[PDB]
Design an enzyme around this catalytic site. Sequence first.
Site, PDB file in Angstrom:
ATOM      1  N   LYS A 143      69.347  79.690 -34.342  1.00  0.00           N
ATOM      2  CA  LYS A 143      70.691  80.802 -34.415  1.00  0.00           C
ATOM      3  C   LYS A 143      70.793  81.789 -33.159  1.00  0.00           C
ATOM      4  O   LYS A 143      71.754  82.266 -32.762  1.00  0.00           O
ATOM      5  CB  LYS A 143      70.337  81.506 -35.418  1.00  0.00           C
TER       6      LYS A 143
ATOM      7  N   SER B   8      69.234  80.414 -29.414  1.00  0.00           N
ATOM      8  CA  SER B   8      69.373  80.299 -28.330  1.00  0.00           C
ATOM      9  C   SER B   8      69.138  79.067 -28.261  1.00  0.00           C
ATOM     10  O   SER B   8      68.837  78.522 -29.483  1.00  0.00           O
ATOM     11  CB  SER B   8      68.145  80.774 -27.625  1.00  0.00           C
TER      12      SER B   8
ATOM     13  N   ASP C  70      57.482  87.103 -36.495  1.00  0.00           N
ATOM     14  CA  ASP C  70      57.929  86.129 -36.637  1.00  0.00           C
ATOM     15  C   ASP C  70      57.096  84.802 -36.324  1.00  0.00           C
ATOM     16  O   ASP C  70      57.302  83.792 -36.291  1.00  0.00           O
ATOM     17  CB  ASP C  70      59.554  85.812 -36.401  1.00  0.00           C
TER      18      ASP C  70
HETATM   19  N1  LIG Z   1      57.339  77.322 -23.564  1.00  0.00           N
HETATM   20  C1  LIG Z   1      57.450  76.279 -23.875  1.00  0.00           C
HETATM   21  N2  LIG Z   1      57.231  75.204 -23.615  1.00  0.00           N
HETATM   22  C2  LIG Z   1      57.180  73.727 -24.311  1.00  0.00           C
HETATM   23  N3  LIG Z   1      58.589  73.683 -25.185  1.00  0.00           N
HETATM   24  C3  LIG Z   1      58.581  75.049 -25.524  1.00  0.00           C
HETATM   25  C4  LIG Z   1      58.480  76.501 -24.935  1.00  0.00           C
HETATM   26  N4  LIG Z   1      59.141  77.200 -25.652  1.00  0.00           N
HETATM   27  C5  LIG Z   1      59.835  76.473 -27.231  1.00  0.00           C
HETATM   28  N5  LIG Z   1      60.065  75.055 -26.734  1.00  0.00           N
HETATM   29  C6  LIG Z   1      59.893  74.232 -27.066  1.00  0.00           C
HETATM   30  O1  LIG Z   1      61.066  74.627 -28.483  1.00  0.00           O
HETATM   31  C7  LIG Z   1      62.190  73.741 -29.252  1.00  0.00           C
HETATM   32  C8  LIG Z   1      61.684  74.013 -30.634  1.00  0.00           C
HETATM   33  O2  LIG Z   1      63.066  74.572 -30.427  1.00  0.00           O
HETATM   34  P1  LIG Z   1      63.339  76.221 -30.430  1.00  0.00           P
HETATM   35  O3  LIG Z   1      63.343  77.114 -29.892  1.00  0.00           O
HETATM   36  O4  LIG Z   1      64.914  76.463 -30.531  1.00  0.00           O
HETATM   37  O5  LIG Z   1      62.920  76.368 -31.950  1.00  0.00           O
HETATM   38  P2  LIG Z   1      61.393  75.920 -32.913  1.00  0.00           P
HETATM   39  O6  LIG Z   1      61.121  76.919 -32.234  1.00  0.00           O
HETATM   40  O7  LIG Z   1      61.141  74.347 -33.091  1.00  0.00           O
HETATM   41  O8  LIG Z   1      61.957  77.407 -34.108  1.00  0.00           O
HETATM   42  P3  LIG Z   1      62.350  78.556 -34.632  1.00  0.00           P
HETATM   43  O9  LIG Z   1      63.652  78.032 -34.283  1.00  0.00           O
HETATM   44  O10 LIG Z   1      62.924  78.378 -36.109  1.00  0.00           O
HETATM   45  O11 LIG Z   1      62.204  79.605 -33.789  1.00  0.00           O
HETATM   46  C9  LIG Z   1      60.382  72.562 -28.978  1.00  0.00           C
HETATM   47  O12 LIG Z   1      60.940  70.887 -28.959  1.00  0.00           O
HETATM   48  C10 LIG Z   1      59.471  72.968 -27.744  1.00  0.00           C
HETATM   49  O13 LIG Z   1      59.021  71.887 -27.272  1.00  0.00           O
END
Ligand SMILES: Nc1ncnc2c1ncn2[C@@H]1O[C@H](COP(=O)(O)OP(=O)(O)OP(=O)(O)O)[C@@H](O)[C@H]1O
Length: 327
Positions: free
Chosen positions: A47, A49, A154
């Site tokens: 929602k 990013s 969170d």
């Molecule tokens: N620092 C990081 N290093 C590697 N991958 C990351 C990092 N931060 C986020 N990701 C990646 O973000 C993806 C997940 O998508 P997003 O970050 O939008 O949501 P989420 O962490 O699954 O959960 P939510 O959006 O519900 O908080 C994964 O594929 C994960 O590998």
Amino acid sequence: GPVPSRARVYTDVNTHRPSEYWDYESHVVEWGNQDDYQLVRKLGRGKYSEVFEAINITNNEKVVVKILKPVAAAKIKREIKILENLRGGPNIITLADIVKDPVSRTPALVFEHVNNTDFKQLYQTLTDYDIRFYMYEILKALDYCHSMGIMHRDVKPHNVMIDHEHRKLRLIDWGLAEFYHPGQEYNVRVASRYFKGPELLVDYQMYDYSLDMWSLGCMLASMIFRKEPFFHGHDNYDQLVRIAKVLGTEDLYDYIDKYNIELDPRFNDILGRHSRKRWERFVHSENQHLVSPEALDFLDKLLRYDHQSRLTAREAMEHPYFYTVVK
Ligand SMILES: Nc1ncnc2c1ncn2[C@@H]1O[C@H](COP(=O)(O)OP(=O)(O)OP(=O)(O)O)[C@@H](O)[C@H]1O
Ligand SMILES: Brc1ccc2[nH]ccc2c1
Ligand SMILES: Brc1ccc2[nH]ccc2c1
């Protein structure tokens, strides 16, 4: 009206630090060069990013880019100030840079990359020892951010990245994090449904760091009992009924009475009368390898209605459940 509440720890951290530390609105963002980064693949969109795997072409290293949606672009100085304040802290994701995305015309946060092990694979194969080990790692991040006057708000599995080969853990997604100021009323519309503390579900706004400890307990219960999620509410109201079916209604009424909170009258026809259940009720042949008397005692001290009665992160680190963990 409601009885006030204040944290039992780290109550003075934001008053004894200079105003520049917590006054995120006054912070001047130091913009980096967007050309240093080449987007490689879209990892996901939430929602707030769109997330990308990228490469920093000045050092050839993998990075993660979070391009903020306009709805998140408003409260970015808060997230940036928190990330800069916590940078270098134990198990805290490192904010590498802040750039202006040429297409979205919004800020893009650049993070260190974590070669995270698949979430399903970790949930399905972590051993009893690994759960203790990684829970102790998460406690280091939470005690650090709480000691720094910040609550995450969170805490949930997807916000804990683990590179299992290197036994490396990072607590990510600080977009909902806030500075804790005693007496401040906060928005209860934080955390994911299954991890929301009873304080959020009863609309008690004067909460604190201890909300993170409830969320941690929900993660631990799901992990050791093999029940995903542990409290499986259909909506925010049924979420409280699911909790009451485990902790009991009597302690829930003692909680709301202590803080002079009135439940939403819609709970009169759905809450019922429930006794507290013994944690052993949730043990069965498929999860017994993850359960111990120390796990159950630890969980019992996190999953308490009264936010002031939960273990703090530093107290949690002292618990017998972690005695086996190599330090
Ligand atoms: N620092 C990081 N290093 C590697 N991958 C990351 C990092 N931060 C986020 N990701 C990646 O973000 C993806 C997940 O998508 P997003 O970050 O939008 O949501 P989420 O962490 O699954 O959960 P939510 O959006 O519900 O908080 C994964 O594929 C994960 O590998
Ligand atoms: Br314990 C533990 C804590 C957080 C986690 N996130 C993904 C797997 C996992 C395990
Ligand atoms: Br701890 C914990 C609890 C539930 C989970 N689901 C997927 C990973 C994970 C980690």
